[PDB]
């Protein structure tokens, strides 16, 4: 279950490999809009933190989850800053979320005295004052519990369909990035002149099996003039000598 709005589950993704393109390429989402980044170039980036904000809204509200939009959700529930960078992913969840009679676990904030700040969250049920006497603590004239708590029905228009929304934001907080897209690789072919890239080490030469042994620890070896002599392959931990191409 996804949470309602006025209620955000922020996953906090760190220390992992993000196969972003799986989400993009698997066309199971109705909406997959990326701001500031191509959805397919996201794989070449790495962040200190990635946040996934999980919530449920109605179909005609999907368009409000955007840096430039306004409305009941954009302003009182989940506001994105105008400089938002990240991806908004959403899909039709009618199959899980609609109930006959209405699946009333879904809350929306119909009341606030001001717009909500970007990424601000306010989860109080405080009875709202519309005027006159505060009337605090009870509903009444000029006192309104803030959230409607609508339900979803099996019979609906596409707009009343529940949608599950996950918003991915990305940041670099003056720290080593830890959420990286996957590395790609090629097959390893020996006894040919090849332009190599092993981990972060590059150069052209010919690899052959080596008779060297490294402590479990070392990854690369060098000669007396600091030239890489051999490398350990990252997948098969064998040591391969590098000769110059003639």
């Amino acid at each position: 279950r996804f949470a309602s709005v006025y209620a955000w589950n922020r996953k906090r993704i760190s220390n992992c490999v993000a196969d972003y393109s799986v989400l993009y390429n698997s066309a199971s989402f109705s909406t997959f809009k990326c701001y500031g980044v191509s959805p397919t170039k996201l794989n070449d980036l790495c962040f200190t933190n990635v946040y996934a904000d999980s919530f449920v809204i109605r179909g005609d509200e999907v368009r409000q989850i955007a840096p430039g939009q306004t409305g009941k959700i954009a302003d009182y529930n989940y506001k994105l800053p105008d400089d938002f960078t990240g991806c908004v992913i959403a899909w039709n969840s009618n199959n899980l979320d609609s109930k006959v009679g209405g699946n009333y676990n879904y809350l929306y904030r119909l009341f606030r005295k001001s717009n909500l700040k970007p990424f601000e969250r306010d989860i109080s049920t405080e009875i709202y004052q519309a005027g006159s006497t505060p009337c605090n603590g009870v509903e009444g004239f000029n006192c309104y519990f803030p959230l409607q708590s609508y339900g979803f029905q099996p019979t609906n228009g596409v707009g009343y369909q529940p949608y599950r929304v996950v918003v991915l934001s990305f940041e670099l907080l003056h720290a080593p990035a830890t959420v990286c897209g996957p590395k790609k690789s090629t097959n390893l072919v020996k006894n040919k002149c090849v332009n190599f890239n092993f981990n972060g080490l590059t150069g052209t030469g010919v690899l052959t099996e080596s008779n060297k042994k490294f402590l479990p620890f070392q990854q690369f070896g060098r000669d007396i003039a600091d030239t890489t002599d051999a490398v350990r392959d990252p997948q098969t931990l064998e040591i391969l000598d590098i000769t110059p191409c003639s």
Partner: antibody
Amino acid sequence: EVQLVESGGGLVQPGGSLRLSCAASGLLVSRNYMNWVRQAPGKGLEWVSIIYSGGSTFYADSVEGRFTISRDESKNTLYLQMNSLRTDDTAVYYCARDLSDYGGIDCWGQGTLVTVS
Amino acid sequence: ELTQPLSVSMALGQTARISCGGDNVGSQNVHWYQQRPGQAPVLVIYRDSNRPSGIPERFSGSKSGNTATLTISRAQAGDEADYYCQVWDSSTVAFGGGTKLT
């Protein structure tokens, strides 16, 4: 509970503008969604504009280009600045306090007609 | 938008009903107003069926698949008004064209 009253002009010309105003006893303008509702002169009701409680505004594209809705919280006064007037806009303009789903339009004014000719 | 029957007339001592039809589903909350000519619309039915304090007990609402309905338990000459229904659609507040009841 709320005593909401309109104020506005008389005859204005097409292409002109007019500042309309609503205020009420027992109500904070800054805390409500407020609407201006128009009753076409023997034709029927249309929504024209809304100001969100403490927020943004929306307009009926099907009704007008741009007229603006605004509020002054120190006065609890709602305003509609009409512009780009047409004779087509002769109508009764009403004050309205909108509770959306929680309770529809709870409070109405009496209605002020704007004559455009 | 909200469809309308056009009228109810000489409904005296009987019930009276109005229906608004929309792709808008009874799922959209449908509220109702009574506009006596010359007056601002008066909310009569809210959150689909409920009635406000201050109007006759005669009023209540109901709904079908895509249609909201207003019901008056006993019709009187004194109930004449142009009755309306409204929809909160995508921040657009729309109204039906009104039903003439007497």
